[PDB]
Amino acid sequence: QTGYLTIGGQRYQAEINDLENLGEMGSGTCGQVWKMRFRKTGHVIAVKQMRRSGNKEENKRILMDLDVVLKSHDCPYIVQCFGTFITNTDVFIAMELMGTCAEKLKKRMQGPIPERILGKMTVAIVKALYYLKEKHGVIHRDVKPSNILLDERGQIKLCDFGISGAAYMAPERIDPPDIRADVWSLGISLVELATGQFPYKNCKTDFEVLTKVLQEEPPLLPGHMGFSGDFQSFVKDCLTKDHRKRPKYNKLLEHSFIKRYETLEVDVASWFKDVMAKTE
Numbered sequence: 001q002t003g004y005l006t007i008g009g010q011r012y013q014a015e016i017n018d019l020e021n022l023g024e025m026g027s028g029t030c031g032q033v034w035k036m037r038f039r040k041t042g043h044v045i046a047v048k049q050m051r052r053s054g055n056k057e058e059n060k061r062i063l064m065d066l067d068v069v070l071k072s073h074d075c076p077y078i079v080q081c082f083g084t085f086i087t088n089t090d091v092f093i094a095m096e097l098m099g100t101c102a103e104k105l106k107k108r109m110q111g112p113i114p115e116r117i118l119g120k121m122t123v124a125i126v127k128a129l130y131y132l133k134e135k136h137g138v139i140h141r142d143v144k145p146s147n148i149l150l151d152e153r154g155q156i157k158l159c160d161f162g163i164s165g166a167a168y169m170a171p172e173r174i175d176p177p178d179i180r181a182d183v184w185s186l187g188i189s190l191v192e193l194a195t196g197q198f199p200y201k202n203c204k205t206d207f208e209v210l211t212k213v214l215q216e217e218p219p220l221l222p223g224h225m226g227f228s229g230d231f232q233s234f235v236k237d238c239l240t241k242d243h244r245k246r247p248k249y250n251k252l253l254e255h256s257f258i259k260r261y262e263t264l265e266v267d268v269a270s271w272f273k274d275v276m277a278k279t280e
Contacts, residue, residue, distance in 0.1 A: 028161035119261030154269035172243035187238030
């Protein structure tokens, strides 16, 4: 749990001077997150630095999130912790280095992300959220493209940032008369990524977004982009306005969209490399 890195299944003693700092990196929002090279093996990892003298509530958050991450070692869809180093002034948390988050993917692409990618993503994220709920009684409560991470190897994982639970908020979360509010948020994320357009990008304030969520028809995938009936149905189901009728993860895992992408081979890795190459 401290003074070791465990990578691949090989365990190595380690201190922080065994890592070369390769510079900062933006995965999450606040904090400090370094890309670092482990000298003994040449593995490149992410390292969160939590300063002892840091903001009490940033620190609290970091620790609740790590708590969940450490308990989630058996979930393949959540980013893994390799170990920690504790000094008199810092905690360094060694994490799986991912390539990028889906929000930056979207910005790089400057357009729609294909259905087949979104299918693999949906499988992974719904399984992560379900795992969290069932095993740790965690409701994630902030599903959005910036929390969805992809790598060069085609892996998709839920990010550690706020994993211990404005614009992705469910109608019952805005105005309650449930893990199903996360489901709404997933819905909005899939429409945004599938179309390359956030469905409330013309709102100027958080509250205006809220009013759109409650007053307007749910945004649905467009009918003229060649999406499957399955994907259209899945999104429609996620964006059920009445939360009492909106499916749970358990129900969503039986959806024909999920079954198709549990099965189908999709080369996410090559697609991802192509995007990261062709872009700044």
